[PDB]
Design a protein around this ligand. Structure first.
Ligand code: NA
Length: 306
């Protein structure tokens, strides 16, 4: 199992292989509880080898399901890494401190391993701004309820807002990142990496989500097939490892426990310098595909593959 070392010297597992969100929106009412979700989370915790990195979010409304799974697995706490996210775009709690207190209670745990502000755009109805929200995260860091702190979907300019007031500099920024969307907003990857802020990438498998009908003809997809056959791994595995080779943490989820195991096991094989660069270059010659924050960030499309 491989890890990234954040700017504070702490270890985070280099892929996140279980998500705790429903394929559909849920509020939490007992009627809406998904047994199927709690089952897959627990099965994952029980059977996936090494430290299991889970990615969650207040906005999912699935803390119950995750809590039940965390209880009923015999995977010890310290072999689990929970990432959670305060909901800033659409308010569910009063502020991060209240959100996390609620979350700990529902989950029946004492701390999360990483805590993110999910959106740089704050709901009007919040009595907190970004600056004040960050300071709350810094207290949660100091009280040990959040072992690591960061952000999500932040531009360079939004990072600069945080950097200007931060006591504790953000350790992570989780973005949309695939070979077909290589800068969610202008310059984000270059800037983050230059500043020792670890990028996580959600929707890394965008290319396999929207696979065209004449893909047998497109060099990008031909190449991915060629690597799959060389290494005897899935195309998905190759992309997830590509992300890791670009110095970034792929964030993935499946309904299928075998795909979840395969995502953990991307460090069973390796890619060469040449192979990494070729996936990048075939990627960059593809028009940008943006699957999230289309409302907000379409204006940045012209610079997303630049
Ligand atoms: Na999102």
């Amino acid at each position: 199992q491989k890890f990234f070392t954040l700017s504070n010297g702490n270890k985070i597992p280099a892929v996140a292989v279980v998500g705790t969100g429903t394929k559909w929106y849920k509020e939490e009412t007992d009627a809406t509880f998904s047994q199927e979700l709690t089952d897959i989370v627990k099965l994952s915790l029980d059977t996936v080898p090494g430290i299991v990195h889970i990615d969650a979010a207040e906005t999912y409304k699935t803390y119950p399901e995750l809590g039940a799974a965390l209880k009923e697995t015999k995977k010890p706490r310290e072999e689990i890494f929970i990432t959670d996210k305060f909901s800033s775009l659409h308010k569910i709690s009063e502020d991060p401190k209240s959100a996390l207190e609620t979350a700990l209670n529902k989950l029946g745990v004492d701390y999360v391993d990483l805590y993110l502000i999910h959106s740089p755009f704050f709901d009007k109805d919040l009595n907190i701004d970004l600056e004040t929200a960050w300071k709350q995260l810094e207290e949660l860091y100091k009280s040990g309820k959040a072992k690591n702190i960061g952000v999500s979907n932040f531009t360079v300019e939004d990072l600069k807002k945080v950097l200007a007031i931060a006591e504790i500099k953000p350790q992570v920024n989780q973005i949309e990142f695939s070979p077909f969307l290589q800068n969610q907003t202008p310059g984000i990857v270059e800037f983050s990496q230059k500043n020792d802020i670890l990028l996580e990438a959600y929707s890394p498998l965008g290319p396999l989500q929207k696979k065209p009908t004449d893909a047998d003809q497109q060099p990008f997809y031909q190449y991915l097939k060629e690597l799959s056959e060389k290494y005897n791994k899935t195309e998905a595995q190759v992309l997830l490892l590509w992300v890791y080779k670009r110095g970034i943490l792929p964030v993935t989820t499946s309904a299928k426990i075998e795909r979840i195991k395969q995502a953990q096991d991307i460090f069973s094989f390796d890619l060469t310098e040449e192979e990494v660069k070729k996936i990048t270059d075939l990627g960059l010659q593809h028009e940008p595909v943006r699957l999230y924050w289309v409302d907000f960030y379409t204006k940045y499309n012209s610079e997303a593959q630049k």
